[PDB]
């Protein structure tokens, strides 16, 4: 662990420091379940799925 952490601390720089997490980007635009159907009828296929 120590070797990896020191190499990482030495190497990972120049990263953008944007103070944005996933919590804000998911808090707006939530996921709502609607309930519907889509039926694709072909009839030249041997199997239905």
């Amino acid at each position: 662990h120590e070797d990896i952490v020191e190499q990482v601390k030495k190497l990972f720089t120049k990263l953008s420091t944007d103070p944005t997490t996933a919590s804000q980007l998911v808090a707006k635009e939530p996921a709502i379940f609607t309930g519907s159907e889509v039926r694709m009828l072909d009839d030249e296929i041997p199997l239905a799925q």
């Binding site: 609607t34 519907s36 039926r39 009828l41 009839d43």
Partner: protein, 70 residues
């Protein structure tokens, strides 16, 4: 009595996600105007002979009755 191969695609929505009643009374006057303008000839042809025959019989009967008097 059989079926045919079709190849179509359809989308649907659940019953409990859409307003039901407001569709009846939405735009009544244009529907009424369309129905009248489309079926005026059928209404005319249905109701013509009845009116003509009724008027003719009434006229004949009143003329005869008033001519039988003293």
């Amino acid at each position: 009595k059989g079926f045919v191969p079709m190849k179509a695609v359809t989308y649907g929505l659940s019953p409990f996600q859409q307003k039901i009643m407001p569709g009846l009374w939405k735009d009544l006057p244009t529907k009424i105007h369309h129905k009248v303008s489309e079926n005026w000839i059928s209404a005319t042809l249905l109701l013509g002979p009845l009116v003509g025959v009724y008027s003719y019989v009434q006229n004949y009967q009143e003329k005869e009755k008033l001519s039988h008097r003293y």
